[PDB]
Design a protein around this ligand. Structure first.
Ligand SMILES: COC1([C@H](NC(=O)c2ccc(C#CC#CCCO)cc2)C(=O)NO)CS(=O)(=O)C1
Ligand SMILES: [Mg+2]
Length: 298
């Protein structure tokens, strides 16, 4: 039968702090009707300001992916969106009491746990996918982000950081067969000490600590208990790309390859894709058995 749209089965509540703002924030995830998409709702404002998590609403892409509507922003959406994408949630309202999603432990792990504890609900409408049919590339200097046709969903990333902690970093994950939860969800964000005074002077990384980030000095990881994966850095790049890519508003059938890319170039890739309507089409699957991707039991 049809691959169906999914929402949350129960409401999820969490409390935390913004990575960049350091502000205390209350998060509530709620079920939503078919074809809603993921919508962020600033419930601290009167009237409540609602910003769909779509490429067209992205404003800043400096350190994190920020959604903007007028002078209202929702910062650092990428880790929560990665969790939504990885678990195949189409529709949800994300209520926030402040301008930034809580950082939690720096990864998507707490979000996938909270969501999977609440359970998902399959809905009575076909899931829509955006299928890549032509190569679409954006470049800026030595950075590159590309979509390639691929019968499934796969993300590759290569980073060239000149830094002792890497002993070149590259990974490729095929989710049409390897699972977001186990391969990527637990990969934490990271920051270099050389940047933190500068960042904090610009009101960035104000909530950052060893509790919610891999902190790297000149030569080593400062976190007492070390890394969750040997290649945690590049796995986090992949986590970020999955989230930024979900700003398309539908799951992808295709391959993403990133080369020193980040939030700004990821968003540029989506905008270029959306503009080139020869490069993609919207599809559904009336038989899950012949589809190129699958999802975990809800
Ligand atoms: C821009 O850097 C990335 C970004 N993370 C951050 O900007 C970022 C993450 C953590 C910190 C920190 C810290 C700290 C500390 C202790 C001293 O106060 C500072 C910045 C992030 O994960 N955005 O989603 C994208 S990435 O290269 O994969 C990591
Ligand atoms: Mg990140």
């Amino acid at each position: 039968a049809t691959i169906k749209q999914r929402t949350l089965k129960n409401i999820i509540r969490a409390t935390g702090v913004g990575l960049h703002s350091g502000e205390k924030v209350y998060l509530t995830l709620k079920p939503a009707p078919v074809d809603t998409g993921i919508v962020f709702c600033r419930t601290d404002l009167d009237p409540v300001v609602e910003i769909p998590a779509r490429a067209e609403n992205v404003g800043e892409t400096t350190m994190s992916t920020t959604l903007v509507k007028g002078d209202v922003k929702v910062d650092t959406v990428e880790h929560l969106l990665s969790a939504m994408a990885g678990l195949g949630i189409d529709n949800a309202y994300v209520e926030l009491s402040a301008s930034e999603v809580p950082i939690m432990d720096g990864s998507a792990g707490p979000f996938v746990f909270l969501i999977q504890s609440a359970g998902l609900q399959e809905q009575e409408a076909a899931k829509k996918f955006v299928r890549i049919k032509r190569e679409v590339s954006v470049e800026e200097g030595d950075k590159r982000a590309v979509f390639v046709p691929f019968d499934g969903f796969k993300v590759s990333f290569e980073i060239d950081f000149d830094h002792p902690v890497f002993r070149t970093q590259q990974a490729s994950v095929d989710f049409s067969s390897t699972s977001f939860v186990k391969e990527v969800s637990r990969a934490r964000t990271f920051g270099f000490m050389r940047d933190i005074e500068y960042l904090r002077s610009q009101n960035l990384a104000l909530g950052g600590s060893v509790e919610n980030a891999i902190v790297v000095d000149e030569n080593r990881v400062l976190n007492e208990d070390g890394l969750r994966y040997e290649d945690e850095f590049v796995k986090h790049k992949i986590l970020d790309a999955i989230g930024d890519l979900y700003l398309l508003g539908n799951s992808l059938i295709g391959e993403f390859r990133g080369f020193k890319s980040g939030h700004a170039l990821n968003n540029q890739l989506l905008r270029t894709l959306i503009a080139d309507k020869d490069a993609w089409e919207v599809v559904t699957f009336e038989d899950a058995r012949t589809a190129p991707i699958s999802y975990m039991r809800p």
